[PDB]
């Protein structure tokens, strides 16, 4: 399951995990490629249980998206120790899979 | 007058939406980004800026902007232009749709900028009053080289004339 | 609150550009026309008005306006609607291009109105501040029957939500 | 020849002919159908010399166009005694020809 982050405080404490790889899918409900990649992120979440998966709606929590310099959706950002390790922009299954494996 | 003086960027900012061929390669929907005029000018040695009254309006669409698109490759490669910025007061979604309708495929070297409330355009005296306190951009062109304005001019009759604001006028000052 | 009171048209006006199938029959290029809100309301017994933040923006384009276009024929023929007005602060050329991209073929019963400087939308409290004194329309819907507002409501979260402003909400109040 | 009217005073004194049928082509330089009909109006002008032909650029003399409720180009307006008798909207050669003949 991919847990939706509905606010800044929820986003911040998701990041405040520590050591555990955290992945956030920055999405928009109106976005074709976002809708496309969603069932796929659920599948990556089932596969890599050593990593915690989240989704954030860029129009609902816009200040979070702006701070992360997300200017495109989907953008998946990969965090460790509360800090970004890498990001993958676009509906790119291979790149997302690889970003998880090498950082999990 | 602005010529031979530092580009008055101050704290002014614009919004635009990226367009690309390679972030079509990673299909994604694009959002507006905010750009600081001061950052744009310090990062890019040679910048052309042209203002137009309204996205999708006839003179802007038929007579003014297509020239900049037409000459773009020549500007970047032969005249060493880094950025061409098309300034309107229109929202960034309408500007992006306008750019696409005009054949813009990539925003690496050309960006359609929203100047919200005409703030920056009014600061340089290139605004057009359209009634009851509403301002659009007039029609104008500017060249900035190493942070210095080397050319700036505004149409007397922006709704009809493409003279000093034309790409042909700009090319002569390159 | 506006409900059950006279439509507060006052001296407010909007601009729009006509679209037609039969003045394509006489090929001609169209210009913006100014319409008095008071004249529109007195000439038409039943009027739907909906406001949206920005022409070409995603929620407005995908989730909000297509519903009004989709249901248009039903509204005119079965619910006896005379006019559907889509209100933005965007220039009338961008609004017309937006309408066309959305599949509008004729402006007899549907008009995309420019409310310049958000003057009318601010007067009814349905504006959205977007920074430094710039206002877009919020997202809202209204029904006017014989000059009286019988329904009016604005989204709490206009950028994301199509609830009270949806055509489905409007249909229920017809 | 079709004479261009460059201002309100030129428009008003064109209309201040009297009895003589006056025709004004409200045009725009950017307008496809305007450009199309122009060579044609020149031909109507040569044919009907008992009528005086003019053109007005709606973006140059906008207050005149607005007062005449021209919202479309081309619009040809037909005047007699300083007052409109009829108008033809669009690039419609037959309708324009007929509007001249029955009012000349």
From Swiss-Prot, chains A, D:
The biological process GO terms on file are: cell redox homeostasis; deoxyribonucleotide biosynthetic process; endoplasmic reticulum to Golgi vesicle-mediated transport; glutathione metabolic process; protein transport; retrograde vesicle-mediated transport, Golgi to endoplasmic reticulum; sulfate assimilation; vacuole fusion, non-autophagic
**Which is one Pfam family of this protein?**
Thioredoxin
- Record-listed cross-link Glycyl lysine isopeptide (Lys-Gly) (interchain with G-Cter in ubiquitin), residues: 67, 97
This protein's major location comes to cytoplasm
Disulfide linkage: 31-34
Which molecular-function annotations from GO does this UniProt entry contain? disulfide oxidoreductase activity; protein-disulfide reductase activity
Where does the record place the site Contributes to redox potential value?
Answer: 32-33
Q: Where is the active site?
A: 31 (nucleophile), 34 (nucleophile)
Q: How does it sit in the membrane?
A: Peripheral membrane protein
Other comments on record: Present with 17237 molecules/cell in log phase SD medium. Yeast has two cytoplasmic thioredoxins, TRX1 and TRX2, and one mitochondrial, TRX3.
Q: Which NCBIfam families match?
A: thioredoxin
Q: What does this protein do?
A: Participates as a hydrogen donor in redox reactions through the reversible oxidation of its active center dithiol to a disulfide, accompanied by the transfer of 2 electrons and 2 protons. It is involved in many cellular processes, including deoxyribonucleotide synthesis, repair of oxidatively damaged proteins, protein folding, sulfur metabolism, and redox homeostasis. Thioredoxin-dependent enzymes include phosphoadenosine-phosphosulfate reductase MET16, alkyl-hydroperoxide reductase DOT5, thioredoxin peroxidases TSA1 and TSA2, alkyl hydroperoxide reductase AHP1, and peroxiredoxin HYR1.
Q: What is this protein called?
A: Thioredoxin-2
Swiss-Prot record, chains B, C:
EC number(s) for this protein?
Answer: 1.11.1.24
Classify the main location.
cytoplasm
Site of covalent link Glycyl lysine isopeptide (Lys-Gly) (interchain with G-Cter in URM1): 30, 46, 77, 79, 105, 122, 154
Q: Which GO terms describe its biological process?
A: cell redox homeostasis; cellular response to oxidative stress; hydrogen peroxide catabolic process; response to metal ion
> What Gene3D superfamilies does this protein map onto?
Glutaredoxin (3.40.30.10)
Specify the cross-link site (Glycyl lysine isopeptide (Lys-Gly) (interchain with G-Cter in ubiquitin)): 46, 79, 111
The enzyme's main class, written as a single word, is oxidoreductase
Which residue ranges does the record assign to the Thioredoxin domain? Answer: 7-174
The reaction(s) this protein catalyses: a hydroperoxide + [thioredoxin]-dithiol = an alcohol + [thioredoxin]-disulfide + H2O
| Active-site residues (renumbered) | 60 (cysteine sulfenic acid (-soh) intermediate)
Matching PROSITE patterns: THIOREDOXIN_2 (PS51352)
Locate the Cysteine persulfide modifications and list their residues: 60, 118
Subcellular location, in the record's words? Cytoplasm
Q: Where is this cross-link: Glycyl lysine isopeptide (Lys-Gly) (interchain with G-Cter in SUMO)?
A: 154
What the entry lists under CDD domains is as follows: PRX5_like
Q: Name one Pfam family in it.
A: Redoxin
Please give the Gene Ontology molecular function terms for this protein: thioredoxin peroxidase activity
Q: Which family does it belong to?
A: Belongs to the peroxiredoxin family. Prx5 subfamily.
Q: How does it assemble?
A: Homodimer; disulfide-linked, upon oxidation.
Other remarks in the entry: The active site is a conserved redox-active cysteine residue, the peroxidatic cysteine (C(P)), which makes the nucleophilic attack on the peroxide substrate. The peroxide oxidizes the C(P)-SH to cysteine sulfenic acid (C(P)-SOH), which then reacts with another cysteine residue, the resolving cysteine (C(R)), to form a disulfide bridge. The disulfide is subsequently reduced by an appropriate electron donor to complete the catalytic cycle. In this typical 2-Cys Prx, C(R) is provided by the other dimeric subunit to form an intersubunit disulfide.
The name on file for this protein is: Peroxiredoxin AHP1
Upper classification of the source organism reads:
Eukaryota, Fungi, Dikarya, Ascomycota, Saccharomycotina
């Amino acid at each position: 399951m991919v847990t939706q982050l509905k606010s800044a405080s929820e986003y911040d404490s998701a990041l405040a995990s520590g050591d555990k790889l955290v992945v956030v899918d920055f999405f928009a409900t109106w976005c074709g490629p976002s809708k496309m990649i969603a069932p796929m992120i659920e599948k990556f979440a089932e596969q890599y249980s050593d990593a915690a998966f989240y989704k954030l709606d860029v129009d609902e929590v816009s200040d979070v998206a702006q701070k992360a310099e997300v200017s495109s959706m989907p953008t998946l950002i990969f965090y460790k120790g509360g800090k970004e390790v890498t990001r993958v922009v676009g509906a790119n299954p291979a790149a997302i899979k690889q970003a998880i494996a090498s950082n999990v | 007058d602005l010529v031979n003086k530092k580009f008055p960027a101050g704290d002014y900012k614009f919004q635009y939406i990226a367009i690309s061929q390679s972030d079509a390669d990673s299909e994604s929907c694009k959002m507006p980004q905010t750009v600081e005029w001061s950052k744009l000018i310090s990062e890019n040695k040679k910048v052309i800026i042209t203002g137009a009254p309204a996205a999708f309006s006839p003179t802007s669409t038929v007579s003014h902007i297509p020239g900049y698109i037409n000459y773009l490759d020549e500007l970047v490669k032969e005249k060493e232009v880094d950025q061409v910025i098309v300034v309107t007061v229109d929202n960034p979604f309408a500007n992006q749709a306008w750019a696409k309708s005009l054949g813009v495929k990539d925003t690496t070297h050309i960006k359609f900028a929203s100047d919200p409330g005409c703030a920056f355009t009014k600061s340089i005296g290139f605004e057009l009053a359209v009634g009851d306190g509403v301002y659009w951009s007039g029609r104008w062109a500017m060249v900035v080289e190493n942070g210095i304005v080397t050319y700036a001019a505004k149409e007397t009759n922006p709704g009809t004339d493409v003279t000093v604001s034309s790409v042909e006028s700009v090319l002569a000052h390159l």
